Design a protein around this ligand. Structure first.
Ligand SMILES: [Mg+2]
Ligand SMILES: [Mg+2]
Ligand SMILES: [Mg+2]
Ligand SMILES: [Zn+2]
Lengths: 156, 145, 104, 131, 292, 251
RNA sequence: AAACACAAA
RNA sequence: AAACCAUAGUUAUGACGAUUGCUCUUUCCCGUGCUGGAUCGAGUAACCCAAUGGAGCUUACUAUUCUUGGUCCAUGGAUU
RNA sequence: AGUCUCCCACCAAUUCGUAUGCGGAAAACGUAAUGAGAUUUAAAAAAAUUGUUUAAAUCAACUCAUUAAGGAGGAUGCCC
C-alpha cells in the first residue's frame, strides 16, 4: 500500500511509492533519452525568472466583515423602489453565504440554511420582485447568450 | 550579512639566470623559458609557511596579526604554478606587498612572484585563468610553425 | 512574599482605601468620591473576595459615589432628603440632581 | 579646502616605578632614541623602523617628538604598546602620551627654547608660503 | 568620567589565601590609576562553574571594601565596586546565582562553549559578556543574537590590558576583537584594562589610539567610556540594590548623592538610609520661593 | 531505503547539480501529509452602576481640574490688581468681597493635616517602623513599596529632565497613568500641579522621632513607574533597555 | 550569504 | 534540449583626489532684516544591505552619533 | 530587514455572478461621519511584527457596530 490511513488523514510514503515503480521510471528515462541515459550530466536547466511564480497560502480566503455582517442580518431576520433592491440584495446575500466557503467559515456555529429556511425566503422575495411590475420587453431582446450588443452613437 | 572576501591570483616565474648560454629572443621562447615548471619540493603548506614568515619579517607583529585572520591558500597545483590566496578586502594591499617582497624558497632559489588578478569571487578568477590559458596557447601555436 | 504576611498587607490596604473613601473631600467633592470608589472596587475585585450585601446595597451613590448620610467630627450631610413613600420611598443627594427609588 | 599638515607634535614622558632604580639611573637623549628604535622594531617591522622622528627639548623624563601627519597612527599605536626590558634600567619603562597638538600652541614653562624653535618654524612658514 | 571595570583580584578559588604583597600591589595600582586620572574602578573576581559554592553569605566577598579600601579611599578620592565573572562552559546543575548576584554588584560571564553562550544570552541574568581573548573563539559569532542581546541588555567587553602579557597572545587578541566588533555592530562595546600591576597601565589617549587602530572610531570610544560605562554600572548597581526598577533606596538631592556615586552613606548590611528630617509639610512648595 | 536512496540520488543528479544537497539539508520529506486544512441580575446591575460611576467621576475630575485652573488665574489677577501680597489678607479679602469664587478655591490648610497623618500611619504600619530598627528587611520593604498605594502621598520632585520641575512638594489627590497630580502652596500660589513622569525622579521621607530625629530616604522613578503591579503580585516583568536613565547620572 | 517551507527550532 | 531574460543583477557594486551646499560656534560692514557676503575651527549621521518582478501593512533609524514642519485644558519666566 | 497577505491562463458561471461608506483587479488594504466600549468587556491583562509594545484628567492612538450609486421637490443656515 503506497498510501495508508492514520491519525489525521491519509499518509503517502515516497519511499515505497518510488521503490515499487522503478523499472517503469527506467523505461521512461530510456524512452526520453537514448544515448544520454548512459551519461550522467546536467540536461534540465534552471527555470527562467520570468516564468518563476510565487506560492500562495493554504487557506481558502478571508471574507470582508461588511458582507459577513449583512449576510448575518439577512439570515437572522405595494413595495417602494428601495425595498426592491433590499429584497434583491437579501436573496444575493443568502445565495452567496450558501455557496461561499469563506463566509461559511465566518458564519457562527449552529447556523445552517435548513434552519434559516433559505428556500422559502427566496421564493417569497422572488414573488415580490415578480409583483414589482417590471417591463422586460421594454429593455430589449438580444441576439446571443453572452452580453454583446452594439453601442454606436449617431451624431451624438 | 556577508563576509567580504578578495581572492588573489599569483604566478611563480623562474628567470633564466644563466649568463654562459645564449638565448632566443621571441615571445613564445621566453614564455616557455619562464613557464618551464615548478620543482617537486612545492606544496601548499610550504608556500603558506614561507609567506607567513615573510609577512612577519617585512610588516612585523601587528602587521602579521591583522593579516593572518583569513589568510588561506584555497587552490594550488604544482603543475601550472597557479594559486588562489584568500584574504580580506582590507588586507589585500598587505598580501600583495608580501607576495612582491617574496625573496626565495628555503631550498629553491632564483624565482619571482607575479600577482596577476585580484577579485572578490572565485568564479571570475577561474574565468580569467581560463582566458589566460587560452591566450597562452595562441603564441605557442603561432611559434610552432 | 509570604502569604501570611500578604494577608496583613491586604487587610491594611483595604482599610486604607476605606479610610481614603471618607474623611472630608470624598464627602464634599463628587470627583474624589467616585475616583476612590472605583479604585477600592478595582482593588477588591483582584483579591477574589465578595463584599457584604447589607453594606453593598445602601452604601454609596450610583451617579457620583458619595456615601448616603443624612443629618466627634462634624461634616457635611450627604443627601438632599429622604421622604416617605409619597408613592414609593426615594432618596436624593446634594452633589448631583438625581434620586434613587426603592419600593417596599 | 584644507591645509596640508607637515607633521604633528607629541608630548612624551617616561613613567618608571621603583623610586630607588628610578633615581639610580638617569636617561638621556641617546637613551630615548635607542628606546624608540627598539620599540618600533619590536612592535613593527621595517614599516615602523622607517618612521621619521626627531628630538626637541629632551629633559629628565620629558621630550617632544614630531611625527608626520600620515604616521601619527603608527606612532601612537607603537608608543602605548612597547615596554622596555633590560636596556639601561633595572625597572622596565612605560610611556604615556600626555597631550598632542597640531598648531604648536603649547607652553609648559616660560623658557626660550620653544621661542627659538617657533622662530625657526615661522621663518620656514613664510618661506613655504612664498616658495 | 573614566571607568575601568576589569581590575583583576589575585585569587581564583576560595581555597586560596591572598598574601599581603598582592594587596600592597593592588593599593599601589589603585594609587597609580588615581594619580594620572580616573573616576570609577570596579575590581573583578573570577571563579569557575563546576566548583562548590560555599553555603555562606558573609564570606562570599573576600574584598572587604570597608576594611582596607576603607583605609585607602579617604586619601585617594574614588570608589570601588565588586564584580564577578562566571566561567561557564557546560550547563551543569551547579547554579546558585541567587546568592552571589545579590552579594556582589556586577555579574559577568566567560563562555567557552556554544550551549553555555546560548543559555547565558537567553536565560542567565548577567551584566557584561567577556570572552577568553587568550584562547580561541568558540564559534563564528552571529549578528542577530548579539544585536538582540544588546537591545535586551548585556553588552560585550573588550580588554586591551591582556595584549601586554606576552607576544603570541596579541594575534589572537586582535583576531577576537575584530570579530567581536564586526558581529556586535559597534553598539554595546565596553572597554576595560585587565592589569594586575601598575606598570601595565596606560593613559586614556593610549587607550583611544589602540582602539582606533583596532577599528573603532575615537568618538565612539569616548561615548562608550563616558555614557555606556556609567549605564552598565548603574544597571548592575540598582538591579541588586533596588527592586526591579520600580523603587529606589536612594534619594538624589543635589549632584553627588547618587546610587552609584554615594557609596559610604548607603548601608550595605541592610538597605536603609537613615537621614535627618529635611522634608516638612509647612515649607513652601516652590523651591524658588522656599527659603530657610 | 539504501538502494532507494541510490535511485533518488541518480535521479537528482540529472535535474540538480549537487545530488547530496537536499539529503544533507533535509529537504526530502519521507512523509506526504494528505488532509484538508483544519443570580446574574444584581451582578449586571452592579457592573453597570460601576461603569456609570467611573464615567461620571472621570468628567467630574476633569472639570474640577479646569475649574481650579481658571480660579487660580482669576484670583491671582485680582490680587495683583488689588496689590495684596500675603495669603492671609488675600483669602479674607476674597471671602468678604467675592463669595462665589471662594467656594471653588481649595484650602491647603484643609488638605494637609489628616491626609499627612493618615498616610504616615499607614506607611509606618506597612513597613513595620518600630522603636528599634534592627528588625528591618530591605527586599520585602521594597517589594511592599512597589505594591503599596500612593493615594494621598507626599512626594518631592528632586530630579527631572526639565530644570524647572525640580523641588516641588505636593500631596496626591489622584494617581493617573501619564501625569502626576499634586497641590502646592506659595505666597499666593494655590496651583494644582500636573507633572510628567517620563524622565523625572520623586522621593518621599518618612519621619521617625521617638528618641532621635531621623527619617528614611526613599525614592521612586516615574519613567519605570508605569509598568508595575497594583495591589497584587505575580506579573511577569520584562527588561526594557535600562538605557534612558542617562539624566540620572548626567545631573 | 541571500532567497525559499501547513518544515525544523 | 531549450525556454537565459534586469536603463544594479547572483556572495560584485571598488580605490582615493577635487567642488558646491547643509547645522552650531570666535569676527567686520551697509538698513533693523533679508536659503545678504567673507575669514578661525568641528561633524556628513544611523538602521543597515539586493538574489525574479509589483502593491498594501507592520516593525528598526536620526542625543557634541547630519536635519526639517506643525501641535500641545505640559511646565518655567515677563506684559496687559 | 521581517516564520505577514495577494496578482503574475480563461470560463452569461457547482468558476466566492459580491450593484453592500469611498478609491481599488485583489489584498491580515488606505481613508471619511456618528455612537459606545476596558480581564466588571464583542474582544488586548494578573496569522506576522515589535526593547519599551492601545487607552484607562482632557486631547492623541487601537478595536468593533451603522452609513448602496445618480436624477427631481420642500424646509433650514451663509454671501446675497
Ligand atoms: Mg535579503
Ligand atoms: Mg532571511
Ligand atoms: Mg527578504
Ligand atoms: Zn449623585
Amino acid at each position: 500500500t503506497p498510501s495508508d490511513l492514520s491519525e489525521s488523514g491519509s499518509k503517502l510514503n515516497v519511499d515505497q511509492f518510488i521503490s515499487s515503480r522503478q523499472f517503469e521510471v527506467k523505461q521512461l528515462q530510456l524512452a526520453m533519452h537514448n544515448s544520454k541515459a548512459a551519461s550522467s550530466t546536467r540536461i534540465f536547466q534552471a527555470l527562467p525568472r520570468k516564468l518563476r511564480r510565487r506560492t500562495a497560502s493554504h487557506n481558502v480566503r478571508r471574507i470582508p466583515k461588511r458582507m459577513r455582517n449583512r449576510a448575518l442580518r439577512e439570515m437572522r431576520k405595494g413595495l417602494n423602489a428601495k425595498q426592491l433592491y433590499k429584497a434583491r440584495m437579501s436573496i444575493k446575500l443568502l445565495r452567496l453565504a450558501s455557496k461561499s466557503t469563506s463566509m461559511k467559515l465566518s458564519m457562527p456555529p449552529e447556523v445552517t440554511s435548513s434552519n434559516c429556511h433559505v428556500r422559502q425566503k427566496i421564493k417569497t422575495l422572488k414573488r415580490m420582485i415578480k409583483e414589482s411590475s417590471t417591463a422586460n420587453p421594454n429593455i430589449k431582446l438580444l441576439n446571443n447568450r453572452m452580453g454583446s450588443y452594439d453601442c454606436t452613437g449617431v451624431n451624438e | 550579512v556577508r563576509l567580504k572576501s578578495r581572492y588573489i591570483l599569483f604566478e611563480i616565474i623562474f628567470p633564466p639566470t644563466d649568463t654562459n648560454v645564449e638565448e632566443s629572443v621571441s615571445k613564445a621562447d621566453i614564455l616557455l623559458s619562464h613557464h618551464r615548471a615548478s620543482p617537486a619540493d612545492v606544496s601548499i603548506k610550504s608556500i603558506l609557511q614561507e609567506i607567513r614568515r615573510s609577512l612577519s619579517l617585512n610588516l612585523g607583529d601587528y602587521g602579521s596579526a591583522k593579516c593572518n585572520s583569513l589568510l588561506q591558500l584555497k587552490y594550488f597545483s604544482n603543475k601550472t604554478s597557479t594559486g588562489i590566496i584568500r584574504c580580506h578586502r582590507e588586507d589585500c594591499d598587505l598580501v600583495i606587498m608580501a607576495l612582491m617582497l617574496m625573496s626565495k624558497i628555503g631550498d629553491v632559489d632564483g624565482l619571482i612572484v607575479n600577482p596577476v588578478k585580484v577579485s572578490g569571487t572565485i568564479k571570475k578568477i577561474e574565468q580569467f585563468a581560463m582566458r589566460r590559458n587560452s591566450k597562452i596557447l595562441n603564441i605557442i601555436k603561432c611559434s610552432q610553425s | 512574599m509570604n502569604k501570611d504576611q500578604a494577608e496583613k498587607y491586604q487587610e491594611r490596604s483595604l482599610r486604607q482605601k476605606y479610610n481614603l473613601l471618607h474623611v472630608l473631600p470624598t464627602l464634599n467633592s463628587r470627583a474624589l468620591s467616585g475616583l476612590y470608589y472605583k479604585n477600592f472596587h478595582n482593588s477588591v475585585k483582584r483579591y477574589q473576595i465578595m463584599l457584604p450585601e447589607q453594606l453593598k446595597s445602601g452604601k454609596f451613590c450610583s451617579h457620583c459615589g458619595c456615601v448616603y448620610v443624612p443629618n466627634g467630627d462634624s461634616d457635611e450631610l450627604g443627601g438632599e432628603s429622604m421622604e416617605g413613600p409619597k408613592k414609593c420611598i426615594q432618596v436624593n443627594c446634594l452633589n448631583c440632581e438625581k434620586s434613587k427609588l426603592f419600593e417596599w | 579646502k584644507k591645509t596640508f599638515r607637515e607633521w604633528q607634535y607629541f608630548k612624551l614622558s617616561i613613567t618608571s616605578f621603583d623610586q630607588d632604580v628610578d633615581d639610580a639611573h638617569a636617561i638621556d637623549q641617546m637613551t630615548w632614541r635607542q628606546w624608540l628604535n627598539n620599540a618600533l622594531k619590536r612592535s613593527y617591522g621595517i614599516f615602523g623602523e622607517g618612521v621619521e622622528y626627531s628630538f626637541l627639548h629632551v629633559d629628565d623624563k620629558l621630550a617632544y617628538i614630531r611625527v608626520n601627519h600620515a604616521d601619527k597612527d603608527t606612532f601612537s599605536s607603537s608608543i602605548s604598546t612597547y615596554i622596555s626590558t633590560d636596556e639601561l634600567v633595572g625597572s622596565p619603562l612605560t610611556v604615556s602620551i600626555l597631550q598632542e597638538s597640531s598648531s604648536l600652541r603649547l607652553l609648559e614653562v616660560t623658557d626660550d627654547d620653544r621661542l627659538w624653535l617657533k622662530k625657526v618654524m615661522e621663518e620656514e612658514e613664510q618661506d613655504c608660503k612664498c616658495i | 568620567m573614566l571607568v575601568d571595570l576589569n581590575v583583576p583580584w589575585p585569587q581564583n578559588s576560595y581555597a586560596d589565601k591572598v598574601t599581603s604583597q598582592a594587596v600592597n600591589n593592588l593599593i599601589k595600582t589603585l594609587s597609580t590609576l588615581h594619580m594620572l586620572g580616573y573616576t570609577h574602578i570596579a575590581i573583578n573576581f573570577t571563579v569557575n562553574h563546576s566548583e562548590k559554592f560555599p553555603n555562606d553569605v558573609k564570606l562570599l566577598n573576600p574584598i572587604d571594601i570597608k576594611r582596607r579600601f576603607g583605609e585607602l579611599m579617604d586619601r585617594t578620592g574614588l570608589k570601588l565596586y565588586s564584580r564577578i565573572t562566571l566561567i561557564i562552559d557546560d550547563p551543569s546543575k551547579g547554579q546558585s546565582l541567587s546568592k552571589i548576584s545579590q552579594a556582589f554588584d556586577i555579574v559577568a560571564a566567560l563562555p567557552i562553549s556554544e550551549k553555555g553562550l546560548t543559555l547565558s544570552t537567553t536565560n542567565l541574568d548577567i551584566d557584561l559578556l567577556t570572552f577568553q581573548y587568550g584562547s580561541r573563539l568558540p564559534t563564528f559569532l552571529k549578528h542577530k543574537s548579539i544585536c538582540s542581546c544588546v537591545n535586551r541588555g548585556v553588552k560585550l567587553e573588550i580588554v586591551y590590558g591582556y595584549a601586554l602579557r606576552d607576544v603570541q597572545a596579541r594575534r589572537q587578541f586582535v583576531s577576537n576583537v575584530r570579530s567581536v566588533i564586526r558581529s556586535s555592530r559597534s553598539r554595546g562595546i565596553v572597554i576595560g584594562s585587565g592589569a594586575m600591576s601598575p606598570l601595565e597601565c596606560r593613559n586614556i589617549l593610549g587607550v583611544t589610539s589602540l582602539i582606533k587602530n583596532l577599528g573603532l572610531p575615537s568618538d565612539r570610544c569616548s561615548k562608550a567610556m563616558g555614557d555606556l560605562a556609567s549605564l552598565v554600572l548603574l544597571n548592575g548597581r540598582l538591579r541588586n540594590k533596588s527592586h526591579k526598577q520600580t523603587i529606589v533606596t536612594g534619594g538624589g538631592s543635589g549632584n553627588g548623592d547618587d546610587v552609584v556615586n554615594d557609596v559610604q552613606g548607603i548601608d550595605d548590611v541592610q538597605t536603609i538610609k537613615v537621614v535627618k528630617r529635611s522634608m516638612d509639610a509647612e515649607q513652601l512648595g516652590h523651591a524658588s520661593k522656599r527659603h530657610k | 531505503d539504501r538502494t532507494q536512496t541510490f535511485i533518488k540520488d541518480c535521479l537528482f543528479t540529472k535535474c540538480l547539480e549537487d545530488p547530496e544537497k537536499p539529503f544533507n539539508e533535509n529537504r526530502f520529506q519521507d512523509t506526504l501529509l494528505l488532509l484538508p486544512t483544519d443570580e446574574s441580575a444584581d451582578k449586571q446591575l452592579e457592573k453597570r452602576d460601576y461603569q456609570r460611576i467611573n464615567k461620571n467621576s472621570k468628567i467630574a475630575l476633569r472639570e474640577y481640574i479646569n475649574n481650579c485652573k481658571k480660579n487660580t488665574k482669576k484670583c491671582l489677577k485680582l490680587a495683583y490688581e488689588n496689590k495684596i501680597t500675603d495669603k492671609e489678607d488675600l483669602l479674607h479679602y476674597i471671602e468678604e468681597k467675592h463669595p462665589t469664587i471662594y467656594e471653588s478655591l481649595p484650602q491647603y490648610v484643609d488638605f494637609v493635616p489628616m491626609y499627612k497623618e493618615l498616610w504616615i500611619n499607614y506607611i509606618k504600619e506597612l513597613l513595620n517602623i518600630t522603636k528599634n530598627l534592627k528588625t528591618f528587611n530591605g527586599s520585602l520593604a521594597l517589594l511592599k513599596l512597589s505594591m503599596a498605594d500612593y493615594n494621598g502621598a507626599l512626594l518631592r520632585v528632586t530630579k527631572s529632565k526639565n530644570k524647572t520641575l525640580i523641588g516641588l512638594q505636593g500631596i496626591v489627590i489622584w494617581d493617573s497613568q501619564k501625569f502626576f497630580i499634586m497641590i502646592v502652596k506659595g505666597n499666593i500660589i494655590d496651583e494644582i500641579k500636573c507633572i510628567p513622569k517620563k524622565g523625572t525622579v520623586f522621593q518621599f521621607e518618612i519621619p521617625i522621632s521617638d528618641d532621635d530625629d531621623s527619617a528614611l530616604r526613599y525614592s521612586i522613578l516615574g519613567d519605570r513607574f508605569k509598568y508595575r503591579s497594583v495591589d497584587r503580585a505575580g506579573r511577569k516583568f520584562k527588561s526594557r533597555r535600562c538605557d534612558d536613565m542617562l539624566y540620572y547620572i548626567q545631573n
